[PDB]
Amino acid sequence: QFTDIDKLAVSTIRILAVDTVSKANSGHPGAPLGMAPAAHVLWSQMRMNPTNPDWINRDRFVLSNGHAVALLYSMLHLTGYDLSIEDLKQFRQLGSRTPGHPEFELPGVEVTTGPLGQGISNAVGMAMAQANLAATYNKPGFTLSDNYTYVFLGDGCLQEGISSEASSLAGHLKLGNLIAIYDDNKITIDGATSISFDEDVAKRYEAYGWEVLYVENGNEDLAGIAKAIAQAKLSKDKPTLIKMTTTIGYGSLHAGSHSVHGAPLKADDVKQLKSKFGFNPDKSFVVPQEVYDHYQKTILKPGVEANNKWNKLFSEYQKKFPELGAELARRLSGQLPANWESKLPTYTAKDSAVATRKLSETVLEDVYNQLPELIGGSADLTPSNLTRWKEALDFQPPSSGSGNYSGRYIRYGIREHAMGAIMNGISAFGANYKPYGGTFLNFVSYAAGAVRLSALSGHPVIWVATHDSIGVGEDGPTHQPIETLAHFRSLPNIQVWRPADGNEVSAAYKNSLESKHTPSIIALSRQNLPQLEGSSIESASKGGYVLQDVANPDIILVATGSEVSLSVEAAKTLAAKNIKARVVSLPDFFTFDKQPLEYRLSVLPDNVPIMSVEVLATTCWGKYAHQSFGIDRFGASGKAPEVFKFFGFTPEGVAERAQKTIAFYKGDKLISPLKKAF
Amino acid sequence: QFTDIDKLAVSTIRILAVDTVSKANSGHPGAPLGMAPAAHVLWSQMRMNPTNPDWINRDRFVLSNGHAVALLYSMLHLTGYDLSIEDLKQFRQLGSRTPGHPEFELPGVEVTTGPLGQGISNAVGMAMAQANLAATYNKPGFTLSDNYTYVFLGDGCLQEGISSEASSLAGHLKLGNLIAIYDDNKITIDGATSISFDEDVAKRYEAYGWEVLYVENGNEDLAGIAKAIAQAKLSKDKPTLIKMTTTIGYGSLHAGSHSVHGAPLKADDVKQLKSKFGFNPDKSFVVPQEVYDHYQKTILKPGVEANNKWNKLFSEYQKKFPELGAELARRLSGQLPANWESKLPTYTAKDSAVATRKLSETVLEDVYNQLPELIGGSADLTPSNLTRWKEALDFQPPSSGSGNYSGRYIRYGIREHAMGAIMNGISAFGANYKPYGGTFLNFVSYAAGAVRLSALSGHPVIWVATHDSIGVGEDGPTHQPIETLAHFRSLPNIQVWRPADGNEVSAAYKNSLESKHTPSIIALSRQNLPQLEGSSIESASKGGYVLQDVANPDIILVATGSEVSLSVEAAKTLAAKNIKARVVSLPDFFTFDKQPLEYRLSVLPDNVPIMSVEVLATTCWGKYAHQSFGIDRFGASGKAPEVFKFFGFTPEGVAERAQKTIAFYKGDKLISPLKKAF
Ligand SMILES: Cc1ncc(C[n+]2csc(CCOP(=O)(O)OP(=O)(O)O)c2C)c(N)n1
């Protein structure tokens, strides 16, 4: 049941969204106008506290078609969130709380969206984290976790391959609290969908195991829209897609056209719209009092009460289940277990040569039980990534017989881009969830649209990226990374760890898991690497450090990963012809760059030749080294020692390029690459 | 009608494949064993000349599941292509002709595959290029083009989102000559597909508009497989997926296990397998004379005859039709029209300030008419990219009414990753097709998977990448590139053009269209830019050049795109203070690096501080500059001129950092960043 006030609230939403876009003279009015009825019906029945946007058991809303952002900012204002009319008047302007696409950082905005296909795939991750939280902490009489995940989406999201991968996994996992509403308005930027998008969507979604419901009149059928949503709540075992037909830019003089997609409405058009809906055409950013009163009564006071009952329940739960209640209280505060890092493995020079992939396996097996918030996964490369702890139970529907929702190991299938946006979703859910995902380093590049949002939003997800170089060997250039780490070291706000040995792998895991706002790629080797004399977790935690020192060196060798042991053999060959080399291990550029300049210049000082050593692209190394020995062409298919050799990466090959660097600069005064002038 | 020689042929393929893998002691034996029946039936019925792998009307085969390579190498050898037993005996070894995943360079290998989902999406483009050549050149009595495009694919390919984008578009365009055979074997690397992949594949492909056919026993039912391929060739207006159930590693002691996916069979398993098939278990790389004789009569001599007929009909064609005959003859020779570049727009300082994206649009208007082989499109950004020429016909099915198959503008929809692979498949088809695709620069990263294979194989595809920087303005950080060019400049064999004005846009299109082995990204501005005094097609074609010279410069300013004009302005500001600045324009790192070292040192000499100016990451500039002014953080939502002012990119803002640079180095001797020690 809906009344006259509900229709006044739908008109107030539509005109607020239109006035926001028109003052900015930039933005997208069309999908805001077609989806306002659904937004009113959905938010009115969501359990949420506007006053406490972090309540762990709030229902979650994701706007996947992020260009429709004027609608999400109109709803957040009208329902009581911290977003005022003056912020809406600053839409798309420099420095405002209202950017052109929603950002994770704003209260009530769940994830950053706007790149198409990301929001629906993040919503699949949020629904998985809910299903895991519920299966881990709910007890008879204590339903602490039972929220819904709701998603709005458009034609562009359904054409993106990423939202196919996420929807196929979501259907397999039978995530029944995930309810997606598709704005089926037959329009994208180039015009009618008929021109390149006429697949049967409803049929594709039933193939994935989703339930598909239909709303023929999304423009005005409030009871049908409400019907459709509570029927979706009944199907516990299936995710649900509600295909809802609307007119893009409903109410506009050019309603139904692609011209209303992504440009402000004409002033004369805005005036007849306002007149039509019973509003004064000469006034702007007008909210009727009855509307503020209505959302106070139906959303905000019920939501504040719901959150208060949930808090009473949780403090009873902590009395009843002291261990589980202390664990979830610690997680809800963002804190890792005190002294958790005492459990990280440390090594010495006498321990054996191990590939850093197997060393990473050992860290996940030694800390999994210390950290209940750690949830892992592989994009079908579990045996090659060594991401699986053996006591692990898989994250699966309970009816499968392979695991249940309390499991902490996810089988992502061969879906790297949805694995990245799903890990962003699990992270964004809350409760200190620490998602990691595995794949070969070369195919993290398949997930670049999502990894970029991990860095922009600040979601601290971990990519466990194995098979980091030509050390892959025989699979050849299609599988051997060359450009990949130069790519992600150019991306702001991401750690790119390329650990050299066991102590450096524990350092990489310590910093990655302690991060609250920075994602991490941990690049790992196929081949065996020795345990280095001079490495430690303390040192390697600084991002870069002096591994092997010597007084008054002729050169500094800076290396990463498998090339650190090579540079150390190279300096032995150099010592024998009386050249003194300092060897510097640089396991992460990000973390090194964050150290104070005094520390960084003690690692890479003035007046010494510095040569970098790394079997990948040399394009990023001008910030740390004068000369660079790397590989700026594709790899080669053959046995890994033979391929290293072919590229010149032997102790004598490295020592010879160092002897050439010393000769080239002999008698010149050198300045550390670190020193900037501005 | 198969006989005992077809069973001996299928056994020799299985065993030659197992031996190829077992001698390397590396590789994937499972799917070559399961798909050998279907490869025998398909290749026996394909029209191809093995002594001319370039015949334009040859039927094409793509192995999308690239790790099954030993099956392809086997077939090429047996049917008389240029690949010997000796080559197979060097599989996965350094320097061999048989690398561990198939490469475009080998005759008979149509594209490089291995990265999953690529091959099936390339095959879509090969089908589109065929439907356009047939429609442009076939005349009554002269059917010059009519080939089929055959695809083998596996489960991994079906999980990747790129094959959903490509399969959706393929159904829309009604590509009836595309026939794909799905190896339905129930296993992927992590075990059984039920663990993460239980969707209804058939029902999903019928929703895209494809026909689905089934072969329940692919292990042995040759007639059934031949009956599916024959019925699929009747599919004239629907692509066809043949779901063929097989057992992974059929014949092995561990057939149906994922342990047989990506490791050699144990030596005694290979023995029993040889005995089971009627082969001596102590001999290897054995091809029965009967199998060679048979392929010579079924494939090779009929293919030579089919090519020879096709040759005489093309001679008749050129006489009946001299105009189209001459054009098709020039395209098959792979040459661009005599002196086509004369139609490229040139400009002077006196002309208007134009966005570089709209200069791009004018070039495509002046050339689509000169170049029949130019086929373009956009990933639903046609109005924002100005990629559609006014007189263009869209590439659509005739039934659509919206255009037809001789049309040369493709509506790809929001499918960037598939647009990249489809462009690779159109280029790989031959006949000098020059594909280009438009999207925003920030979302070319959605397509990184395919862009890397354009560079690795050398497909000269062109990306018209608009909205190159914070000059996007109001859409904000989710749409503003920062790291994107640093990434593709770190990738070997790809041109990344960032033109500053009218003449540099023309030079970017002439080098990109003349290119035979190197892809290109052209980054273009949303905002208006001045026509530069001193720019020319001839100088910008060198990749970097002196735009503004002075004798005895205090500083060199190196810049690209929108920051070249800013740099000219800052140089007027520095001139006022008695500082003399040479301005260098560097529209492409790749083309500039190809110039002779003495030309590069003339542009960037020793003894002068060199400062780079570009509103994107600074990390790749150390190969050219001493110091760099750029943005190493994400963008901001606001009007574009206010955002440029916010980051310091003002004439006097560049001038001030130029003065600090002069100050910091005054007194030091400076080496060109171009000079290397080894
Ligand atoms: C990955 C990606 N590619 C391209 C764009 C640019 N873009 C923004 S909206 C849009 C299509 C509009 O799609 P739709 O969801 O149908 O719009 P609506 O009906 O919501 O107006 C495009 C191509 C994008 N934001 N992200």
Ligand SMILES: Cc1ncc(C[n+]2csc(CCOP(=O)(O)OP(=O)(O)O)c2C)c(N)n1
């Ligand atoms: C994009 C990409 N991601 C990951 C891999 C690693 N990989 C190779 S085969 C495969 C899984 C097995 O796929 P399937 O097609 O089911 O194999 P088959 O049944 O043919 O053995 C994976 C994950 C890859 N080659 N490309």
Ligand SMILES: [Ca+2]
């Ligand atoms: Ca739409």
Ligand SMILES: [Ca+2]
């Ligand atoms: Ca399979």
